[PDB]
Short mmCIF file of C-alpha atoms in Angstrom, two decimals:
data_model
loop_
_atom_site.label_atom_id
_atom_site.label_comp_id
_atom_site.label_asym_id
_atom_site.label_seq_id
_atom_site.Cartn_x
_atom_site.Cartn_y
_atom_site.Cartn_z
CA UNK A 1 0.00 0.00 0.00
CA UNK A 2 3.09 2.70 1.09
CA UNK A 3 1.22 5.70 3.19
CA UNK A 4 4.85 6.83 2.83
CA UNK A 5 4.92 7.03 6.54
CA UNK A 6 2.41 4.55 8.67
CA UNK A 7 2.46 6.04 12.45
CA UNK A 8 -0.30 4.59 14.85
CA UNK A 9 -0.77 6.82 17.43
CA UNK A 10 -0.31 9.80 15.79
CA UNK A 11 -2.28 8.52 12.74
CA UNK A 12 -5.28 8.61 15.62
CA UNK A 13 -4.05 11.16 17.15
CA UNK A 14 -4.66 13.08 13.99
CA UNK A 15 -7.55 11.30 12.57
CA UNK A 16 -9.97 11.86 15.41
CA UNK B 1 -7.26 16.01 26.33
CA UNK B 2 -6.89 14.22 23.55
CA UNK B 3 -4.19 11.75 23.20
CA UNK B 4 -3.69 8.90 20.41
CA UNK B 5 -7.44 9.43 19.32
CA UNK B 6 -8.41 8.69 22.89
CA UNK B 7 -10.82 11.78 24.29
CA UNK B 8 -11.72 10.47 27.85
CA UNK B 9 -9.23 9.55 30.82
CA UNK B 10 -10.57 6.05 31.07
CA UNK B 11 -10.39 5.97 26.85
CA UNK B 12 -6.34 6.70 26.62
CA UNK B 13 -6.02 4.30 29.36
CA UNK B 14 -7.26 1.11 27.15
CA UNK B 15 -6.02 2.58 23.59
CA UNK B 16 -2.71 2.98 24.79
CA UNK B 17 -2.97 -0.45 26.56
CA UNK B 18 -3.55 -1.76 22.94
CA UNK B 19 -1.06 0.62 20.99
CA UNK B 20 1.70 -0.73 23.24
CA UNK B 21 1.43 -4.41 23.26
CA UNK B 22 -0.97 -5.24 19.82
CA UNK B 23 1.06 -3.18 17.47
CA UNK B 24 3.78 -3.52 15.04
CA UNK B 25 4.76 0.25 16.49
CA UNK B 26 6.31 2.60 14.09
CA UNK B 27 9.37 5.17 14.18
CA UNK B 28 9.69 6.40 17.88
CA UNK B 29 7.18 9.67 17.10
CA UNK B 30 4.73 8.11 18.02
CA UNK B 31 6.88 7.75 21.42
CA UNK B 32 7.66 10.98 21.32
CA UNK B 33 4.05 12.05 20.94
CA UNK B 34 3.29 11.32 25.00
CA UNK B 35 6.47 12.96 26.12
CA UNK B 36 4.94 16.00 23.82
CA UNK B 37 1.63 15.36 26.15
CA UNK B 38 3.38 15.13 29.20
CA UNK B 39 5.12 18.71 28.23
CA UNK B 40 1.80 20.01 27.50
CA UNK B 41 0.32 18.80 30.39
CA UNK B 42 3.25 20.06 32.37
CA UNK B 43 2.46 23.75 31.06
CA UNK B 44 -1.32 22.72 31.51
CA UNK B 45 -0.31 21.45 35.13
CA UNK B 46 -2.67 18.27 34.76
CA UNK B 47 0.31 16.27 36.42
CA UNK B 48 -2.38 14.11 37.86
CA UNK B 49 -3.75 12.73 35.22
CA UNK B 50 0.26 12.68 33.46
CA UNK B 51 1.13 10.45 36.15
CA UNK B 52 -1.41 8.34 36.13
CA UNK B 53 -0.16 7.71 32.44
CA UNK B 54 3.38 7.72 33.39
CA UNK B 55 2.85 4.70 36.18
CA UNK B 56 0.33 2.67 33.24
CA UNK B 57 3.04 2.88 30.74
CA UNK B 58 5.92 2.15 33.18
CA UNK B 59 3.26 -0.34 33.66
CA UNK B 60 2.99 -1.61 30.45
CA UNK B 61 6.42 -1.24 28.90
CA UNK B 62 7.71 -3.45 32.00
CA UNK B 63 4.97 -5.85 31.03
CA UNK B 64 5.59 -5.24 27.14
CA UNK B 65 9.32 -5.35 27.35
CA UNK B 66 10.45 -6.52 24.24
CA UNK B 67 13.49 -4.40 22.25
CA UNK B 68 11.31 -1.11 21.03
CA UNK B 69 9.08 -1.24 24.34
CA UNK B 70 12.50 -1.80 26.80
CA UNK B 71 13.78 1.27 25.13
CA UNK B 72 10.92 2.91 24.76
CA UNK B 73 10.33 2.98 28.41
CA UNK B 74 13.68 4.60 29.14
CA UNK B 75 13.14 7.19 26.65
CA UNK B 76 9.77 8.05 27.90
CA UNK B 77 10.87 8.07 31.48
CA UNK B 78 13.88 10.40 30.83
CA UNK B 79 11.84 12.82 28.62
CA UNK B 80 9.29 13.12 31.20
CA UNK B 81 11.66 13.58 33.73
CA UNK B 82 14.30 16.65 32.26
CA UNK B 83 11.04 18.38 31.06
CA UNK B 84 9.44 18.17 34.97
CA UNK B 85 13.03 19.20 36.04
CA UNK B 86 12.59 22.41 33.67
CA UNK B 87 9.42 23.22 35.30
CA UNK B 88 9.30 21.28 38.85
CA UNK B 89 13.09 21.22 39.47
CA UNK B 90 12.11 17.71 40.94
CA UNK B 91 11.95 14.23 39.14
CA UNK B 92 8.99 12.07 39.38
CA UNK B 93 9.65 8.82 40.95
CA UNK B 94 6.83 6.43 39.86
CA UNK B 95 9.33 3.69 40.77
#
């Protein structure tokens, strides 16, 4: 897939 | 109070309980972000709730310690603790 950078936390920590 | 998607105190509590010991974890940011929360909350002085994540993920990354996790709890420890000096002048001893 390649999101170019995959964080976690900060992907939800973002996303919310 | 928002922290890893988590809104609530009792929600960051579980998520992070997951993010630490159900994920692949990526690049130490994501690391870093709670030492940017525990700043925050330094500045915010909302130590209690802080510490209460502090002692979880001391908690957790004992429980969890596997390469990433062992050093992830020594750079979230330190972090914490040189920030708190800045402000406090004292380190927190959750331990």
């Amino acid at each position: 897939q390649s999101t170019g950078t995959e964080p976690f936390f900060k992907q939800k920590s973002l996303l919310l | 109070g928002n922290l890893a998607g988590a809104v609530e105190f009792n929600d960051v509590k579980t998520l992070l309980r997951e993010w630490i010991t159900t994920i692949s974890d990526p690049m130490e940011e994501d690391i870093l972000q709670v030492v940017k929360y525990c700043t925050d909350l330094i500045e915010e002085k909302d130590l209690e709730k802080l510490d209460l994540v502090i002692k979880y993920m001391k908690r957790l990354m004992q429980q969890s310690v596997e390469s990433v996790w062992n050093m992830a709890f020594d750079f979230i420890l330190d972090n914490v603790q040189v920030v708190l000096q800045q402000t406090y002048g004292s380190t927190l001893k959750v331990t």
